[PDB]
Design an enzyme around this catalytic site. Structure first.
Site, mmCIF file in Angstrom:
data_model
loop_
_atom_site.group_PDB
_atom_site.id
_atom_site.type_symbol
_atom_site.label_atom_id
_atom_site.label_comp_id
_atom_site.label_asym_id
_atom_site.label_seq_id
_atom_site.Cartn_x
_atom_site.Cartn_y
_atom_site.Cartn_z
ATOM 1 N N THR A 76 -4.642 1.215 -2.222
ATOM 2 C CA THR A 76 -5.204 2.510 -2.617
ATOM 3 C C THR A 76 -5.336 2.640 -4.140
ATOM 4 O O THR A 76 -4.341 2.546 -4.864
ATOM 5 C CB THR A 76 -4.331 3.670 -2.087
ATOM 6 O OG1 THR A 76 -4.293 3.623 -0.654
ATOM 7 C CG2 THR A 76 -4.877 5.032 -2.545
ATOM 8 N N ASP A 130 0.828 -1.202 0.000
ATOM 9 C CA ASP A 130 0.000 0.000 0.000
ATOM 10 C C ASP A 130 0.862 1.250 0.000
ATOM 11 O O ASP A 130 0.519 2.261 0.616
ATOM 12 C CB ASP A 130 -1.003 -0.022 1.172
ATOM 13 C CG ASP A 130 -2.116 1.019 1.019
ATOM 14 O OD1 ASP A 130 -2.337 1.526 -0.094
ATOM 15 O OD2 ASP A 130 -2.775 1.334 2.023
ATOM 16 N N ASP A 145 2.957 2.707 7.982
ATOM 17 C CA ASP A 145 1.652 2.113 7.635
ATOM 18 C C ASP A 145 1.774 0.684 7.081
ATOM 19 O O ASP A 145 1.622 0.445 5.866
ATOM 20 C CB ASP A 145 0.882 3.026 6.671
ATOM 21 C CG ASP A 145 -0.470 2.443 6.234
ATOM 22 O OD1 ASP A 145 -0.971 1.458 6.836
ATOM 23 O OD2 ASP A 145 -1.032 2.987 5.264
ATOM 24 N N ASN A 194 1.862 7.734 2.981
ATOM 25 C CA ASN A 194 2.555 7.004 4.048
ATOM 26 C C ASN A 194 4.056 6.963 3.810
ATOM 27 O O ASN A 194 4.793 6.168 4.402
ATOM 28 C CB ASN A 194 1.941 5.610 4.302
ATOM 29 C CG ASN A 194 1.922 4.730 3.056
ATOM 30 O OD1 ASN A 194 2.781 4.847 2.182
ATOM 31 N ND2 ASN A 194 0.947 3.829 2.982
ATOM 32 N N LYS A 243 2.494 4.682 -0.942
ATOM 33 C CA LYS A 243 1.868 5.892 -1.487
ATOM 34 C C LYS A 243 2.418 7.146 -0.794
ATOM 35 O O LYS A 243 2.973 7.057 0.296
ATOM 36 C CB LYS A 243 0.340 5.812 -1.340
ATOM 37 C CG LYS A 243 -0.097 5.508 0.070
ATOM 38 C CD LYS A 243 -1.612 5.419 0.205
ATOM 39 C CE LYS A 243 -1.986 4.960 1.616
ATOM 40 N NZ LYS A 243 -3.449 4.895 1.816
HETATM 41 C C1 LIG Z 1 -3.759 6.611 10.596
HETATM 42 C C2 LIG Z 1 -3.929 6.120 9.178
HETATM 43 C C3 LIG Z 1 -4.649 4.767 9.172
HETATM 44 C C4 LIG Z 1 -3.771 3.599 9.625
HETATM 45 N N1 LIG Z 1 -4.474 2.362 9.459
HETATM 46 C C5 LIG Z 1 -4.427 1.396 10.431
HETATM 47 O O1 LIG Z 1 -3.965 1.507 11.557
HETATM 48 O O2 LIG Z 1 -4.987 0.282 9.901
HETATM 49 C C6 LIG Z 1 -5.185 -0.864 10.739
HETATM 50 C C7 LIG Z 1 -5.883 -1.863 9.843
HETATM 51 C C8 LIG Z 1 -6.070 -0.527 11.931
HETATM 52 C C9 LIG Z 1 -3.874 -1.482 11.178
HETATM 53 C C10 LIG Z 1 -2.428 3.586 8.917
HETATM 54 N N2 LIG Z 1 -2.016 4.918 9.313
HETATM 55 C C11 LIG Z 1 -0.720 5.081 9.844
HETATM 56 C C12 LIG Z 1 -0.257 6.372 10.024
HETATM 57 C C13 LIG Z 1 0.990 6.497 10.592
HETATM 58 C C14 LIG Z 1 1.612 7.779 10.875
HETATM 59 C C15 LIG Z 1 1.073 8.994 10.495
HETATM 60 C C16 LIG Z 1 1.697 10.204 10.739
HETATM 61 C C17 LIG Z 1 2.915 10.177 11.408
HETATM 62 C C18 LIG Z 1 3.889 11.129 11.854
HETATM 63 N N3 LIG Z 1 3.781 12.472 11.677
HETATM 64 N N4 LIG Z 1 4.916 10.530 12.465
HETATM 65 N N5 LIG Z 1 4.616 9.223 12.421
HETATM 66 C C19 LIG Z 1 3.426 8.958 11.795
HETATM 67 C C20 LIG Z 1 2.814 7.752 11.546
HETATM 68 N N6 LIG Z 1 1.716 5.423 10.944
HETATM 69 C C21 LIG Z 1 1.185 4.208 10.745
HETATM 70 N N7 LIG Z 1 1.929 3.082 11.119
HETATM 71 N N8 LIG Z 1 -0.025 3.998 10.213
HETATM 72 C C22 LIG Z 1 -2.555 6.013 8.530
#
Ligand SMILES: C[C@@H]1C[C@@H](NC(=O)OC(C)(C)C)CN(c2cc(-c3ccc4c(N)[nH]nc4c3)nc(N)n2)C1
Length: 276
Positions: free
Chosen positions: A163, A135, A153, A140, A137
């Site tokens: 996506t 995924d 992510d 992320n 992009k």
């Molecule tokens: C929040 C959305 C949805 C999320 N989706 C999810 O949790 O999906 C599950 C199925 C429940 C596992 C994946 N998101 C992320 C987002 C970040 C992130 C974002 C901003 C950051 C910053 N400024 N510093 N660090 C950062 C880390 N980091 C991870 N690892 N994921 C994006």
């Protein structure tokens, strides 16, 4: 070797929201004992169980723990209370690569080259661990305070043994991904840095997919020739024929592409990034 005792919510001062999905939220937090800033992902256990996301959450905790490389957001710790799981992640102060694309329109060749090079170097590491992102992009692909990338992510990653706009054709015509899926995503992202827009655009998801399987897209007249050539060696319907994949003998030929002629591959995160 003893680790530091479990942390808890009261150990932090929570601030603004950094990112949002329908199952989790990333919040900025300052640890009081150290004044360090972390990006804490908060997940409500009941909602994740309800929505059958436990495999995705586990998958991300497992992957992000084994990653040890400057171009990847790191999972420093986890803890939970009655209702919530907390993941302490690297804080990438400058946010999403997507923001910078929108901000400046489209990158010059120097910046395109450098950021592509970092991305390629991160994928080489990742793929080296037998892990596929699935995924990838600009949303992320984050930027640190020093303006180096930090990829995040990982819940949808696959361990070997997405996506709409970045989805590979194999995902639409078979439902099975490989490392080349990431390389396809990379070809889309390079295209987007140069042109300012993703290659496959349309009114809705169905139309976008229809374009992918037909390989229906084209280059602006103003598009760095060597970048165009590289993109055309990534955006190939046949997954086994994408530059950088195992059947094309891996990352050597990819890194040797003329678009990357002036790149020093060994110490990218120590180099000073080109100003945007
Ligand atoms: C929040 C959305 C949805 C999320 N989706 C999810 O949790 O999906 C599950 C199925 C429940 C596992 C994946 N998101 C992320 C987002 C970040 C992130 C974002 C901003 C950051 C910053 N400024 N510093 N660090 C950062 C880390 N980091 C991870 N690892 N994921 C994006």
């Amino acid at each position: 070797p003893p680790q530091p005792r479990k942390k808890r919510p009261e150990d932090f001062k929570f601030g603004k929201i950094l990112g949002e999905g329908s199952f989790s939220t990333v919040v900025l937090a300052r640890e009081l004992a150290t004044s360090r800033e972390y990006a804490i992902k908060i997940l409500e256990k009941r909602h994740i169980i309800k929505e059958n996301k436990v495999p995705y959450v586990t998958r991300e905790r497992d992957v992000m723990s084994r990653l040890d490389h400057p171009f990847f957001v790191k999972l420093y710790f986890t803890f939970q209370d009655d209702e919530k799981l907390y993941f302490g992640l690297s804080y990438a102060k400058n946010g999403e690569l997507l923001k910078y694309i929108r901000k400046i329109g489209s990158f010059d060749e120097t910046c395109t080259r450098f950021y592509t090079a970092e991305i390629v170097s991160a994928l080489e590491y990742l793929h080296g661990k037998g892990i596929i992102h699935r995924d990838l992009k600009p949303e992320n692909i984050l930027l640190n305070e020093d303006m180096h990338i930090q990829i995040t992510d990982f819940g949808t990653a696959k361990v070997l043994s997405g996506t709409a706009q970045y989805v590979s054709p194999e995902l639409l015509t078979e439902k099975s991904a490989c490392k080349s899926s990431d390389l396809w995503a990379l070809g889309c992202i390079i295209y987007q840095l140069v042109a300012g827009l993703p290659p496959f655009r349309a009114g809705n998801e169905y139309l976008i997919f229809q374009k992918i399987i037909k390989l229906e897209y084209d280059f602006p007249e103003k598009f760095f020739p060597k970048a165009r050539d590289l993109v055309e060696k990534l955006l190939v319907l046949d997954a086994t024929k994408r530059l950088g994949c195992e059947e094309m003998e891996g990352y050597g030929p990819l890194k040797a592409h003329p678009f990357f002629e002036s790149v020093t591959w060994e110490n990218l995160h120590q180099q000073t990034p080109p100003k945007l």
